[PDB]
Amino acid sequence: SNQFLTSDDFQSPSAMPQFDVTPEMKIPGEVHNLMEIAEVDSVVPVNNTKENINSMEAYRIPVTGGDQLHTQVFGFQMQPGLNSVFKRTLLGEILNYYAHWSGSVKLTFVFCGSAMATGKFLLAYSPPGASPPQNRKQAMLGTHVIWDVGLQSSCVLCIPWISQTHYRLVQQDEYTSAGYVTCWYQTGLIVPPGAPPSCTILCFASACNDFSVRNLRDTPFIEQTQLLQ
């Protein structure tokens, strides 16, 4: 009509015709899709416990050494964008720019201990309509891998995409409809005389190749509204 849709692509007359643009040169690192920024790993703040968030201690998962053998290392609700563990990483900063999302999440746990240390962890994953495991025996009968840190230093754990519908809303909280990734002590942490007994795990989350987003909007993080000065 004779209206102005703000979401309407139209050519306009150039204000400065007869002007030659500077010839574009080859700059390395061209981006064509926002999903290429989400498919890189970013360090996941798993230890966000209100006295670590203002330090580097909210990136290090503590694995103490001694006699536990039945307790938990960590655990979180597997939903990027709304969970505090994931909403500030590169994947969960791009998901907050969109209202729908669909795809897999790839986790990677790196054991940052000494080469003389040896142990075993049970990395369990629970499905979306399922309760978090409460002990190591319940987590064993679910979906688990055994990460023997004497043999491998990283444990890549890819998480499947299970939903009734095609996409999934980012800003909503369907409790008990996302999945949990917990980790349990299996053996402990065995060190020789001279090695430090306690250690550190780091987690890295990214997207996969089947990832997609839809329905762009404004990020919840920026609250400022008035112009700067």
């Binding site: 204000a15 500077t22 899709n33 926002l34 966000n48 416990t49 503590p62 500030r88 762009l216 400022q224």
Partner: protein, 231 residues
Amino acid sequence: YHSRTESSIENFLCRAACVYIATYKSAGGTPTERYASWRINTRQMVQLRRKFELFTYLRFDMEITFVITSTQDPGTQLAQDMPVLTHQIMYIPPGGPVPNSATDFAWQSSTNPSIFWTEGCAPARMSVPFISIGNAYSNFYDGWSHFTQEGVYGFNSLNNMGHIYVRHVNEQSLGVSTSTLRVYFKPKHVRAWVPRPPRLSPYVKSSNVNFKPTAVTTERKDINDVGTLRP
């Protein structure tokens, strides 16, 4: 298998956005509120600043649209029948004559492209190409403006897009007409390089990258604290 066209760089950085709302009168008094002025910078609006600051180097044309709605001021000496309001919107190309006030020769300069628009029809639109000596605009500049590390830390860079000045063309004696301009800026043919992390700290001013130390994420009860467990 889904489609990834919603998160391309063109579909993510090309939406029109109201970046500047000003008002300008049509009768005398101080020689400042008779016109409007906007130096074209993508730093005063935080929402668009954060999307542009996911990249180091950008290259785009501009697509600026002006939504001008006027009104009749109250008080005595009202115009009754007033013909129609015509407005001049002038784009001062970077390094071009800039109006000190209304009715200045800068307005009648041939060099500065201008649009004469009459009220009651479709809004005024103009397109500006990539205007830089360099080969891209830079959202960041780790460096200085002058030679011997003297000057402001990245503000006199060749990232100048120009100004936009708007005034009434009419010579209206009786009655005042107050117009309000809305600028809907939009980039076209965006090409972006060197992806940067999204900002955590809030902004303080549109000349810096200054910040206050903020937490990396939001707190939780324990390391093994999944939430709610409805069942």
